[model samples]
Target chain A: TQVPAHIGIIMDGNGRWAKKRMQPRVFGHKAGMEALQTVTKAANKLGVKVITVYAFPDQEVKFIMNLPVEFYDNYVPELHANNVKIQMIGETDRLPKQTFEALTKAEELTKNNTGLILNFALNYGGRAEITQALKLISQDVLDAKINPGDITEELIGNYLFTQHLPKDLRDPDLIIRTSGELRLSNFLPWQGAYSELYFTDTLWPDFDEAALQEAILAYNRRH
Target chain B: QVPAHIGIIMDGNGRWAKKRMQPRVFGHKAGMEALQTVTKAANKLGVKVITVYAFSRPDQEVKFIMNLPVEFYDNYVPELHANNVKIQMIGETDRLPKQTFEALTKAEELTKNNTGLILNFALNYGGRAEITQALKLISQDVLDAKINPGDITEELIGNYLFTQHLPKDLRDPDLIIRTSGELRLSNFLPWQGAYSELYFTDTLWPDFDEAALQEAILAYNRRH
Candidate 1:
């Protein structure tokens, strides 16, 4: 009965999973897609309003850019069927044309779906996000839209990439990281300042619906 | 050994004292001693800097916290100098009690020349507060035309944070440790510790001994 309004996940350990199985890292990453799909459905069913997933780390940018454009073309239909809206939070200008096009299509296809908001953090870093916000705020001040005294924590927060999200769901209530990593790795730091963190030893590919439930239960106990 | 900087959120003093049938203030006193123990061990272990959380509300505990400088000056400053540990604070401090502020100023001045471990205390600190203040400064600079707004970058923002006085290399902590079994940052070092490895322990602040510090370091060493 105490589901968090927003949940962020650091989907880690794909490379380690691949190494342990004597397979390529891409093999494990591809396997994690199923886990992501499964977990999203479960989170939606459990009444999670927003779920942000670290889908691509900095090192995997090339891999993501090369993924078949059909992946999103085919994926959007399934999410739309399930009433899930897709959104991306990260740098878009620097992205490859095809990758940017794909994200826009996914977002456009599911804009009206009101069930679950699935946020993909592609090429994301928390420090970079906050730095971008500062630049925007400075520009606004230069243009005389706001004075220096008007700057506050709330004003800075409004300039973040997540500003497009519902006001109440901008900050995550719980953040989960798999594969036993006990760090944020530059994901949503400003928004997750007060988030309840949960770390698990299970790798990304193995994080099933049951794992999601376990994380949610752990979050509940803290309250 | 590679984690040059470490941050700690010393928590659970009240619960520790309650469990021992003593007042919470007593636990805070013990926690101070624990900080000493950990600082000595960390310095010897080759850690460059450590930051500890110490704050109080407008309650009886607040009075005790404000007077901590008197206790600090009388009981701890000499020993800190002997160890060559330099002390610094990261927070809005104008609101601190006069005696407390003076005592802190004296400690910093006395150890300013020491070249050993850096001990940072976060008194009236919050991560958002730090970032907001940094933004305000940036806005003023922009208004003055000292720097264009478009020139603002991550490195520029780092230079405006409260930790700007420290060497650039030591500004960001490699690891951040939180005790008392808490699994959150509690608004601690959000920008500075974005990539910092986190360590959480069940031991309360008063009971976080030298061995526990070593254990936390070892856990950090294990991270690839």
Candidate 2:
């Protein structure tokens, strides 16, 4: 009966999945996009309050720049209607202009809906994220905004992109990595330090409702 | 064929001992034997470094683990030296008891020259504590104008970590294995292990052996 409040997913292996199917790699990305939606809806229905997904990058031109822009027409409205608040983490300014706009529009449209938070980690690296956090914290210390002594785990956490999230939702209770990889791959290092990890051989495009349920079941057993 | 560096969370020693109707100290003592076996096996297999989660933030166990170095040096230090393994530690070395601190220091000094496999112990180590300490040092540098706040990059932060004492290539573990079936890091090498392939086993620390180590290495080779 127990369910994780927040679940982080590292969506991987689209390339290999496409190779197996003899389809273009882009086709696998297209399939994984659908899987993301399906898994998000399934997790939301299971009483999960927050779901953070790493929309793993393939070719920066294809997956990173254009995919979200092309999908926002129908995707944003459908998610907003379902009361799923869209939140994008990572260096958004570094994304293509259209991609950035599409992400922001979805976030703005669903800002007040406040159902399940469908947080997407795009253009994200754990080390890069922490380094950016340190820069701001260090600058603040230099500017007398805060002291070096004020640097605590909570304080450093607040400097990260997840600072905007409700405190409880910031640290994911479970982190799932698909595609048989046993590494976190620089995904949410600080936040996920104590998180129960679930790994599977299933590729991201193949990860579906059943996969989400399996992960949830495994998480319940752990807790 | 094997990981260049391996990190281990040696957990469940006490529980393993309890199951055998033995004292907790007996479990830890037995666990040391397992460590010795794994270290020798890893070295023979050409593994360069092995970092073990020896102790952490705890209460009664903290007191017991603090006294470990004294016994460890007396029993295993000479053997590790003869094996060409260097003993080192990471974490708050100043926080350890004087006797315990000296013993570990002596062991490191004794084995400083002959370096086949670097056997590192994480005593009183918390990943968050390590990160915070790094940030504090970085903040001081910023205030003193030694480096700009903008200069605080990931590599710079890495340089400030306890792992920086290790050779540049050996800092981050290629694989992190946690015994006792735990799927969490428990604050072990959070930054350095960002991309570490994790291996988990139901076998407790005291029961883990050469066969288990080989199995873990095989898994790593397959994934890598």
Which candidate leads in lDDT? 2
Candidate 2, residue B110: how far the Cα is off, in Å: 1.6
Model 1 alpha-carbon drift over 4 Å, by segment: A56-62, A68-70, B55-65
Please give, for residues A1-223, the per-residue lDDT of candidate 1 as tens digits: 6999899999998889999999988788777877888888888888999999885367665675755254586556777788999998988788888888988888888899999899988888889999999998899999999888999988888999898889999999999999888887889989999999999999999999999999999999997
Candidate 2: stretches off by over 4 Å: A57-60, B55-58
Q: What is the TM-score of chain B alone in each candidate?
A: 0.95, 0.96
In model 2 chain A, the worst 10-residue window by lDDT is A55-64
Q: What is the DockQ of each candidate?
A: 0.87, 0.84
The Cα error of candidate 1 at residue B115, in Å, is 0.9
Clashes of each: 0, 0
lDDT of 2: 0.88
lDDT of 1 by residue, B135-191 (tens): 999899999999998789999999998888778999999999898888989999899
